[PDB]
C-alpha cells in the first residue's frame, strides 16, 4: 500500500519563460498566504503541492464551516459547546476537509491564467479494499455509501445511492417481467399496467430517500450556498431578504424570457439527430430486406458507420447552440449552470437511445408501407453508385415483426457488453499505451481526466427509459438490466479508482437534473408502452378511437397511480424531516428553560376563586371612585342559588 | 349602538329539575374555577353569562398561549422579551382573546350533558360601520380582511380573502368571454383554451397567497396543534417524535384502507342522484318537447316538483352512509374530521349542480336519438295516469340545441338571484316572524344558528365549475358571476351580522378541502370544455377520433400550462416564505454573538506565515524525538528558487 502526504496538487503549463514565470511566482505569492507549499518539476510542468500546515488555524476555519452551514438552516444544530476541539466527537471528514482546503484555494484567491488543473490525490489503500469488499458482497448497505462520501464526497455518493436503490427497485420488474415473458407473452396490456405502477413507485420512494439521505449527510439546501459563477450577469445590487449581505440581482422573470428558447432548440434537436437517424434506419431496411446483391455483409455496416460519423457531428453542431444559450439563461452558481446543460443534452440524449425504437414501434411493424418512398430512394441512389446501367436486383419488402425483438436484445445485451469494454477496458487500453516514486505517481495520475459523474448518470437514466418506454416489447429487458447494474456498481467503482483522478469533493442534496428526466421518461413510457401494444399486437387497426382509447387509460392509469402513491407516501414518517423537527424543537425549549427556569408549558385551583373574587373586588372599587353594565352576584354559591331558586319558580308558571 | 359588556354566553336546558338542577350545579361548579358566571334565567332556559375577571391572569394565560404557538413552530418568533405586558405591542385581538376563553370553557373543562350552545354576543357598533365602509367601497382591500380576522377568526376571514381575489380574478375571464360572445361566437375553440390558463393560473396564485396569508396572520400549520377528537379511536400511546409528549397513536396505513370505501361510495352517489336527475330530464323533454294536451304549463311544473323532493330526500340517505362512513375513517382533529365530511358531500353536490348540463351537453344536443326510449317510457306512463284509453296527442322530437342556452341562464341569472332572496330574505323573514335590553337581545341571539363557513365556500366552488367546465357554452357566464360576488361580499357579510350569531373564532391555514375540489374542477374543465366544443359544434361527429383528439391537446395543454405556471411563479419571490426566513435568521445569528462575542461569519495575513513556519517546526521536532514521507523545504522563497533552477533546467534538456 503506497502512501500519500500531499492535500492538494496544482501543476502549472510552461509554455514560455516571460509568461510561465509570472505564473509562478505569484501563484507562489498567494498560496502562501494561507498554504505551504513544495514544489518538484516533472513532466515540463512544474507541480505545485500544498497541503494545510497548522492544525489549529485549520480546525479554527473547519468549525467556522460547521457554523456557516448552521447560519443559513443547511445544518440543523448550532455547534453551540464553542469547544472547536472537543467538537471533533463529530471528526474532520477527508471529505470535509479536501473540500474546505480546495475552497480556500479556488475562492477569491484564485482562478490564475490557465493552470492545467487542481485535484486531490486518491489513497490506494482505501481504493483496495473498496474494490475488494464489493466484489465480495453480494448485497451494498447503507454504511458503504456513507463511506463513499466520506473519502470522496456527496457528489459521488449520491450516484452510488441511486444506484443502489434503482438497482433493488429494478428486481420488481425483472419479476413478472420474466413473469410476462414466460406466461403472458409479447405485448402484453398488464405488463405495461405493472410497469407504470412500478415506476411511479420507484421514483417517489427515491424523492423521499434524496431528503432524508441531505438530512443524514446534513447538506440539505446546499445547492443554494454554493459560490456565485465569475461570469453572473446582474444588473443592480441589493440585500437578501434572508441573511441581508450584499447580494447581486439578475431578474429571475427576465431569465424566464431567455429560457423559452430552449422550446425551439429541442425542436432543433429532434429534427436534426431524428432525420440522421430515420435515414441510416432507412438505408438498414433497403440493403438488408430488399437485398440488393453481393457485398450485403460488406454493405451491411455501411448503415452503421453512418451514424458512428453523424451523431458526434450533428449533435456537435448542436451542442454549440447548447452551450451559447446556456450562458445567455445567465445562472448565478455553477450547480444550475451545469445542470441546466445536462438538461438541455438529455434532448440529443433521448433521441440518439430511442428513435431506432420508435421507428420500429409506431412507423415500421405497425405500417411500414410508408417506408416505400424512402426505400425508391435508395433504389435509384444505389443504382448511381453502382456506375453499371443495370439495375440492382430487388426482392419484395416484407416486413419482420422480429425487428423490435433484436434491437431490443442489443440495447438490453450487446450493447451492455460493449459498454464494459467502452467504459472499463478502453481507459485501460489507453493507460498500458502510456506505458521519487510519490512523484511518478503523481504524473500519472495527473494526466487521468477528473471523474464526471453525469456521465455515469445517464447510463442508468437512459436504461430506466428503456424500461419504461420499451420493455413491454422485450419484458426480459429487466432482467438483463438487473445484472448489469450489480456489475456497474463494482465498475464504475473500479474506473473511479484506476481509470479517473480523484474528484473534488462537491456537495448536492439531489441527484438534480435527473429527477425531471426520470419523471419524463416514465410519464412518456405510460403512453409508449399501451400504444406499442395496441399498435405491434397485429382486425385491422383503428387508430381514430382504437389508439387513442389505449393511452387515455393507460395515461390515466398512470396520473391515479401517481396520487395514490404519493398520498400513501405522505402519510409515512419521514426520518429526515423528523429528525430535523426534533431537534429544532429541544433547542426551541431548551431557550424557553433557560430564560423561564424550567417552568415550561399549572391549574389554579377552586381556593384561588378567593383572589379571583379579590380582583373582582379591585374594578368595582376603581368603577366606584369614578348603569346596568356593572351587575355582578358575587361568589360561586349566591349565583347557584338565585338560579336554583330559578328552577321551581319557573316550573310554577306551568 | 347598543353595548356589551359580556365574552361569552351558556345557555342550559330545562327539562327536569332532577338532570337540569344537575345540570346547573355542576356546571357553575365548574365555570367557577376559572372564570365569573352571572346567571339571569331566559326563554325557559337560565342563561349563563361567562367573562375573565382577573386581567393579569388572563394576559398571563394568553402570553402562555403565544409561546405555544412558538413551540411549535407555527409562531416564527419567540416573545423573548418576557414582559407579558410589554408584549402588549402586539395586543390581545378579541379574536385573540375570544378564542382563547372559548378553550378555557370547551377544554377538558367540559363538554356537559346537553348544554344547548357556547357563542359570543355580536358587536353592533362593528357590524354597523361593516356593512356600511363595504357597501361605500368598490374596491375591498387587504386592512378589511385583516379587520375581519380581528373580531371573527381566521376560518371566516380566509373565506373573504378567498372570495376577494376570486371576484378579482374572475375579472379575466368576463374580458374574453365578452369577447368571445361578442365575436367569436359560441363553442369556441379558443374561449376554452383561455379558460383552462386562467383557472390554472388563478388557482395556483391563490395556493402561494395562502402561504403568505398563513404567514402573515401567524396560523401557518395551525391543523396540526388543535384538540383531538373525543371519540377519535387509538390502539396504543407513544411518544410524538418531535415535542416527545405522549400521544395516541391509531396505524395510519389502516385509515388509508378504510378510506378507500369512498371510492364505491362516490359512485353510489353518481348513481342515486344521476338516475334522479336524468329521470327528471327526461320528463322535462317529454312534456315540453313532446307536447302531451293542455295543462302543459301545470304539468311543466311537475318535474321540478320530483327535484325538491327527490334531491334531499336521496341524498339524504347518501349522507347517513357518508356520516358513517366518516367515522370510521376515524380522525384525529376535529379539523380534519369535517374537512372530509365535506369532501363526501362534494360528490352530492358536484351532481346536483351539473348533471342537468352533462346530460345537455353529451347526450341531449349532440345525439338525442338514444333519449327516445326514455320517451315512450314516458309515453305509456302518462296514458295510464290519464284514465282515458284514449292516447295523449304526441309530435316529434325535435332536438332544440338552446337547451344547453336557457339552462346556463338560470344557473348564471335566475338562481343567483333566487338565490339572494334564500340566503338573505328568507332567513330576514324567519326573524319577522318571530316578531333588560341586553337580555332581550341576547335570548334573540341565541336562537340565530352559528354561522357555517362551509356554505358559503361551495356556492363560490360550485360557481367556479360552472366557469371551469361549462362557460364555454355560454361565455358570458364570468360576467353574471363577477356582477354577483361583488354583492357575494355585501350580502355574506350582511347576514353574518343579522342573520347568524357569531361564530366561535377559529383558526386555519387554508381554505381546506376546497382546495383539491377546485383542482379537480379545473382539470375536469379541461376537459369537459373541449369536449362541449367538438360535440354541441354541429361534417359527420367521429366520436372515434374526433372527440378523443380534442381532449388529448386539450388536456395536455392544461398539463403544460400547469407546469409552465408553477415553474413562473416558483421562480417569483414570496414574502410570508422569506418574512419567516429572515427574522429565523436574525434569532440564528443573535445566539452566535452572544457566545462568540461578535465575532460572526479574517484572514491570517502573510506575515504570519512566521507562525506557520513554527508550528511546521514542532512537529518535525515531535517526529525527531521519535522515512522519505516527512519531507520539506521549508520556507516561502525556498521553494520559489529551487522550482525556478528547475525551469532553466528542463529547457537545457530540449
Ligand atoms: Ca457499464
Ligand atoms: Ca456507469
Ligand atoms: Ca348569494
Ligand atoms: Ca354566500
Redesign the interface.
Same mark, same amino acid.
Given at each position: 500500500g503506497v502512501?500519500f +502526504?500531499i492535500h492538494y496538487k496544482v501543476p502549472a503549463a510552461?509554455r514560455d519563460?516571460a509568461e510561465?514565470?509570472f505564473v %509562478?511566482?505569484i501563484r507562489?505569492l498567494t498560496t502562501?498566504?494561507?498554504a505551504?507549499? +513544495?514544489?518538484?518539476?516533472e513532466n515540463?510542468s512544474?507541480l505545485?503541492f500544498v497541503k494545510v500546515?497548522?492544525?489549529?488555524?485549520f480546525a479554527k476555519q473547519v468549525y467556522?464551516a460547521r457554523?456557516?452551514d448552521? #447560519?443559513?438552516?443547511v445544518r440543523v444544530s448550532?455547534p453551540?459547546n464553542?469547544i472547536a476541539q472537543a467538537l471533533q466527537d463529530e471528526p474532520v471528514v477527508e471529505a470535509e476537509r479536501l473540500r474546505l482546503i480546495y475552497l480556500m484555494i479556488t475562492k477569491p484567491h484564485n482562478e490564475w491564467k490557465h493552470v492545467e488543473s487542481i485535484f486531490p490525490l486518491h489513497s490506494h489503500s482505501f481504493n483496495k479494499e473498496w474494490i475488494k469488499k464489493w466484489s465480495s458482497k453480494y448485497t451494498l448497505e447503507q454504511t458503504d455509501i456513507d463511506n463513499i462520501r466520506d473519502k470522496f464526497g456527496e457528489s459521488v455518493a449520491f450516484y452510488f445511492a441511486f444506484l443502489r436503490s434503482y438497482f433493488r427497485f429494478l428486481v420488481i420488474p425483472s419479476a413478472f417481467g420474466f413473469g410476462a415473458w414466460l406466461l403472458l407473452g409479447q405485448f402484453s396490456y398488464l405488463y405495461a399496467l405493472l410497469c407504470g405502477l412500478w415506476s411511479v413507485v420507484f421514483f417517489e420512494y427515491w424523492k423521499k430517500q434524496e431528503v432524508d439521505l441531505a438530512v443524514q449527510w446534513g447538506v440539505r439546501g446546499v445547492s443554494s450556498i454554493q459560490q456565485s459563477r465569475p461570469e453572473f450577469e446582474w444588473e443592480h445590487e441589493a440585500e437578501d431578504?434572508?441573511?441581508?449581505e450584499p447580494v447581486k440581482v439578475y431578474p429571475?422573470?427576465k431569465? +424566464?424570457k431567455t429560457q423559452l428558447l430552449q422550446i425551439p432548440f429541442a425542436l432543433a434537436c429532434v429534427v436534426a439527430l431524428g432525420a440522421l437517424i430515420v435515414t441510416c434506419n432507412s438505408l438498414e431496411v433497403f440493403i438488408n430486406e430488399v437485398y440488393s446483391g453481393p457485398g450485403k455483409q460488406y454493405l451491411g455496416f455501411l448503415p452503421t458507420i453512418f451514424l458512428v460519423i453523424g451523431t458526434p457531428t450533428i449533435s456537435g453542431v448542436l451542442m454549440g447552440a447548447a452551450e451559447k444559450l446556456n450562458a445567455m439563461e445567465n445562472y448565478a452558481t455553477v450547480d444550475a449552470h451545469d445542470a441546466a446543460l445536462i438538461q438541455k443534452q438529455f434532448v440529443l440524449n433521448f433521441m440518439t437511445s430511442y428513435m431506432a425504437l420508435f421507428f420500429t414501434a409506431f412507423v415500421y411493424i405497425p405500417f411500414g408501407h410508408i417506408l416505400h418512398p424512402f426505400l425508391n430512394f435508395w433504389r435509384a441512389t444505389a443504382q448511381t453508385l453502382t456506375f453499371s446501367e443495370k439495375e440492382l436486383p430487388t426482392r419484395e419488402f416484407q416486413i419482420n415483426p422480429a425487428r423490435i425483438s433484436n434491437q431490443m436484445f442489443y440495447f438490453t445485451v450487446t450493447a451492455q457488453i460493449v459498454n464494459f469494454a467502452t467504459e472499463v477496458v478502453v481507459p485501460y487500453i489507453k493507460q498500458q499505451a502510456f506505458q521519487?516514486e510519490?512523484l511518478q505517481r503523481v504524473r500519472e495520475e495527473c494526466t487521468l481526466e477528473e471523474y464526471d459523474v453525469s456521465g455515469d448518470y445517464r447510463e442508468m437514466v437512459m436504461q430506466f427509459g428503456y424500461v419504461a418506454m420499451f420493455s413491454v416489447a422485450w419484458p426480459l429487458a429487466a432482467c438483463c438490466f438487473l445484472v448489469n447494474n450489480w456489475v456497474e456498481l463494482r465498475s464504475d467503482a473500479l474506473k473511479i479508482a484506476i481509470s479517473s483522478r480523484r474528484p473534488i469533493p462537491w456537495r448536492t442534496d439531489s441527484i438534480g437534473p435527473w429527477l425531471t428526466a426520470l419523471s419524463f421518461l416514465s410519464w412518456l413510457g405510460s403512453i409508449t408502452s399501451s400504444a406499442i401494444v395496441y399498435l405491434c399486437s397485429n382486425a385491422s387497426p383503428?387508430?381514430?378511437?382504437g389508439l387513442? #382509447?389505449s393511452?387515455?387509460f393507460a395515461e390515466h392509469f398512470y396520473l391515479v397511480v401517481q396520487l395514490a402513491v404519493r398520498?400513501?407516501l405522505s402519510? #409515512?414518517?419521514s426520518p429526515g424531516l %423528523?429528525k430535523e423537527?426534533?431537534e !429544532?424543537?429541544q433547542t426551541?425549549?431548551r431557550?424557553?428553560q433557560e430564560?423561564?427556569g424550567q417552568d415550561a408549558?399549572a391549574?389554579?385551583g377552586?381556593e384561588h376563586?378567593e383572589?379571583?373574587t379579590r380582583?373582582?373586588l379591585e374594578?368595582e372599587a376603581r368603577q366606584a371612585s369614578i348603569e346596568?353594565?356593572? %351587575?355582578? %352576584?358575587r361568589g360561586?354559591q349566591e349565583?347557584?342559588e338565585?338560579? !336554583?331558586r330559578?328552577?321551581?319558580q319557573?316550573?310554577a308558571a306551568g
Open positions: 502512501d +502526504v510552461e519563460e510561465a514565470g %509562478q511566482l507562489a502562501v498566504g494561507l505551504t507549499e +513544495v514544489r518538484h518539476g515540463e512544474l505545485v500546515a497548522s492544525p489549529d488555524l467556522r457554523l456557516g448552521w #447560519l443559513h438552516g448550532a453551540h464553542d431578504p434572508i441573511t441581508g429571475p422573470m431569465r +424566464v521519487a510519490f383503428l387508430k381514430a378511437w387513442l #382509447l393511452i387515455l398520498f400513501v402519510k #409515512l414518517d %423528523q423537527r426534533k !429544532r424543537f426551541k425549549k431557550l424557553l430564560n423561564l408549558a391549574a389554579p377552586i376563586s383572589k379571583i380582583e373582582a374594578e346596568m353594565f356593572w %351587575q355582578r %352576584q360561586m349565583t347557584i338565585i338560579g !336554583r330559578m328552577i321551581e319557573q316550573l
